[PDB]
């Protein structure tokens, strides 16, 4: 298979605007949302049909209870942070935990926190320690590292549980996650040459411009990989033309183990 990943995020907001949830948690497999929970609905719900169709109601009931607890814990943790930063107003707290199963069968696992959108604490599951970016984080690092058993627990979760669940979800969603829709690629002039691709899945794609068989990495404008709305993606890359010399330009696209070259006449 291609590389796949499972990730769960949490967002906490300390003084949210009216209606906006103080707490949101969403899971993803690759780029696909699979689950959602927030402090308004108080329910964990599927966000992909292949998730809903394979997990019975008692599953959603169980994790609804767990997320209600995680929500309270996140509030307490954010209250502690903003008090120790001595910050007024509304601030954000974020968590991301997840794992990857790479093509060669190796795995990775990660867990980190952010305050106001900046790295706050980063777990190292090999040295079993927390990296702290400032002295507020340093205080939390010491409290968490004093609980050695919970660091061992997270290492096991990242390396064993997370990968087991990812494989389970990959099979649930295999029709979606393991498919391939090759790109449709074209060039036009706008003076710069624009190489454009659309209709492809998975979103991972590499487009670049070659001049006379040499890759001019610093002379290329790489567009973002963007969702088209229908489950497929689009992207582009442009290079500028030298009107003082003749050169052979070619757009190169790699997607899901297939390479394409479009030579510009």
């Amino acid at each position: 298979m291609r590389t796949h990943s499972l990730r769960y995020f949490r967002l906490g907001v300390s003084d949210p605007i009216h209606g906006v949830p103080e707490f949101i948690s969403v899971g993803y497999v690759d780029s696909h949302p699979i689950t959602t929970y927030d402090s308004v609905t108080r329910q964990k719900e599927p966000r992909a049909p292949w998730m809903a169709e394979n997990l019975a109601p008692d599953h959603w009931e169980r994790y609804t209870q767990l997320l209600r607890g995680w929500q309270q814990m996140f509030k307490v943790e954010l209250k502690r942070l903003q008090r120790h930063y001595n910050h007024s107003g509304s601030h954000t707290y974020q968590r991301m935990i997840g794992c990857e199963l790479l093509e060669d069968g190796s795995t990775t696992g990660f867990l980190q926190y952010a305050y106001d959108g900046q790295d706050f604490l980063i777990f190292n599951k090999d040295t079993l320690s927390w990296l702290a970016v400032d002295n507020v984080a340093h205080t939390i690092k010491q409290a968490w590292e004093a609980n050695q058993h919970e660091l061992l627990y997270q290492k096991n979760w990242l390396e064993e549980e997370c990968i087991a669940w990812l494989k389970r979800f990959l099979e649930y969603g295999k029709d979606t996650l393991q498919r391939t829709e090759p790109p449709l690629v074209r060039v036009n002039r706008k003076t710069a040459l624009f190489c454009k691709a659309h209709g492809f899945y998975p979103p991972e794609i590499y487009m670049t411009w070659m001049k006379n068989g040499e890759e001019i990495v610093q002379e290329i404008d790489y567009g973002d990989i963007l969702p088209s709305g229908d489950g497929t993606y689009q992207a582009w890359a442009s290079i500028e033309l030298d009107p003082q010399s003749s050169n052979l330009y070619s757009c190169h696209v790699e997607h899901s183990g297939v390479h394409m070259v479009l030579q510009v006449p």
Epitope: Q65, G69, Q71, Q72, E150
Partner: antibody, heavy 109, light 116 residues
Framework: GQNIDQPTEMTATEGAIVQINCTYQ??????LFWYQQHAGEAPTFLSY??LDGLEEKGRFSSFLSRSKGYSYLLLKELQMKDSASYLC??????????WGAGTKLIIKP | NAGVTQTPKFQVLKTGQSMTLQCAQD?????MYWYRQDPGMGLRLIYY???????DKGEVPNGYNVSRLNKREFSLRLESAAPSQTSVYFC??????????????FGEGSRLTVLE
């Protein structure tokens, strides 16, 4: 199905050593707990293992093998006050505890 | 610093009688639990409360209900007692749930005997 097994009862001699075994087959794994419960009293926490190996805590050690789904609680230099039941429990993939039925440890003075 | 305090320690009941077991923890824990313990089997969860303001059934909820009255207290109700509910009931608490290594702290137990 999920299950957890430990011997019903064990008898050993004061001053000696005893190893209490616990095997489990679970939907995922997030750690294994041992508790002590004296007759007519509350269970109290003894140990937690989640990676492979042995942890020591005074006269008690707890061992875990994840690939074998096996743990033991090792009691050294047995004293009469060690007479109690010993409960093994596994936290599964959904963070639910599965409890073994307990091993009653009898100590001969 | 009382830990987990549950009452009553003992209670005899007639079939069909109502009974409330009380439980309180002063450890500022978020998660509370009600178990029954019977000979020859492991502890069986009746109902739990992952956090203040939420509860849900465990493995053997039928015949029981609970109230997470506040962060400290978690009562267990037998509305119509049955002989099969003869058991020893344990209340427990933990700092959180949905974490790995956090242990349970148990109350002293409540021994109930239900008789025709």
């Amino acid at each position: 199905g999920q299950n957890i097994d430990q011997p019903t009862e064990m008898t050993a001699t004061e001053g000696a050593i005893v190893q209490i075994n616990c095997t489990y087959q679970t939907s995922g794994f997030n750690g294994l707990f041992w508790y002590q419960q004296h007759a007519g009293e509350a269970p109290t926490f003894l140990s937690y293992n989640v990676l492979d190996g042995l942890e020591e805590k005074g006269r008690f050690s707890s061992f875990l093998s994840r690939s074998k789904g096996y743990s033991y609680l090792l009691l050294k230099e047995l004293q009469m006050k060690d007479s109690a039941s010993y409960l093994c429990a596994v936290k599964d993939s959904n963070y639910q505890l599965i409890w073994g039925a307990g091993t009653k440890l009898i100590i001969k003075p | 610093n009382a830990g987990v305090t549950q009452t009553p320690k003992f209670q005899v009941l007639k079939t069909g009688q109502s009974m409330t077991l009380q439980c309180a923890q002063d450890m500022n824990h978020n998660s509370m639990y009600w178990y029954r313990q019977d000979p020859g089997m492991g502890l069986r969860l009746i109902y739990y409360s992952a956090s203040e303001g939420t509860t849900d059934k465990g493995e053997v909820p039928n015949g029981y209900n609970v109230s997470r009255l506040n962060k400290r207290e978690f009562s267990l109700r037998l509305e119509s007692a049955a002989p099969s509910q003869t058991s020893v009931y344990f209340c427990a608490s933990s700092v959180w749930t949905g974490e790995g290594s956090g242990e349970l702290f148990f109350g002293e137990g409540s021994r109930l005997t239900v008789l025709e």
